[PDB]
Amino acid sequence: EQHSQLNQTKIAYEQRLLNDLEDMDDPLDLFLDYMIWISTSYIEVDSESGQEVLRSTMERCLIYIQDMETYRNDPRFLKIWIWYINLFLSNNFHESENTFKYMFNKGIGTKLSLFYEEFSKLLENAQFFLEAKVLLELGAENNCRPYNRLLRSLSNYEDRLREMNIVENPDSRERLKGRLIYRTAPFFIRKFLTS
């Protein structure tokens, strides 16, 4: 009874993606509605199908919306990228970093504090300690919003740096610059396009 209703809802959303997206003012909203439904209702009943459908839907969303310049600094869009990285790329630093680099190259999220906070966190966890600091400072120099929160994120990070006895001896900036040079789209994007 529940499973059947859930399956009809899945097909209803899939049809809407085919029929309705093209004419929408806010096509991102339809993807968001569907992803929220999958991650709550659908995955609670069928975790293995739900995982696959969530991953595919998120990839479709990113691919469909990515070349629409109007969405470049939409915080809702940014969050989908970061959810994707966290859910699906967490065991893969290179693909995670490549995703952030691809976004950076396309100007996705580059005016939003969250982008720099999350990208810095990735580098921090990977022990690129001073590159992670420079990335936060880069966000501030690009006038990213919310600005004050970014400044507090940087302050808290400097506190973590002191707890590990870390200071410079500008190579960290040049090291970050080297890390930021765009090379290739992440594999999940390339695989989607070729499939």
Residue numbers in the entry: 31 to 199, 204 to 229
Task: Please give me the paper's original passages concerning this structure.
Sequence comparison of BUB1 and BUBR1 shows that these proteins share a common architecture: a conserved N-terminal region, a central nonconserved region that contains the binding region for other mitotic checkpoint components such as BUB3, and a C-terminal serine/threonine kinase domain. The N-terminal region mediates the binding of Hs-BUB1 to the mitotic kinetochore protein Blinkin (a protein also commonly referred to as AF15q14); the interaction is essential for the kinetochore localization of this protein and its function in cell cycle arrest induced by SAC activation (Kiyomitsu et al., 2007).
The crystal structure of the N-terminal region of Sc-BUB1(29-230) from budding yeast was solved at 1.74 Å resolution, and contains two molecules of BUB1 in the asymmetric unit, related by a noncrystallographic two-fold axis, forming a homodimer. Salt bridges between the oxygen atom of residue D53 of one protomer and the nitrogen atoms (NH1, NH2) of R179 and R182 of the other, as well as between D55 of one protomer and K109, R175, and R179 of the other, contribute further to the stability of the homodimer. The structure of the Sc-BUB1(29-230) protomer consists of ten α helices (H1–H10) that contribute three major features: a single α helix (H1), a tandem repeat of three units of the tetratricopeptide (TPR) motif (H2-H7), and a C-terminal region encompassing three α helices (H8-H10). Each TPR unit (TPR1, TPR2, and TPR3, numbered from the N terminal) comprises two antiparallel α helices, arranged as a helix-turn-helix hairpin. The uniform arrangement of neighboring α helices gives rise to the formation of a right-handed superhelical structure with a continuous concave surface on one side and a contrasting convex surface on the other. The amphipathic helix 8, which encompasses residues Y177 to M194, has the features of a “capping helix. Helices H9 and H10 lie parallel to the long axis of the TPR core, establishing extensive polar contacts with TPR helices H3, H4, H5, H6, and H7. The analysis of the crystal structure of Sc-BUB1(29-230) strongly suggests that the impaired interaction between these Hs-BUB1 mutants and Blinkin is due to the disruption of stabilizing interactions among α helices of the TPR units.
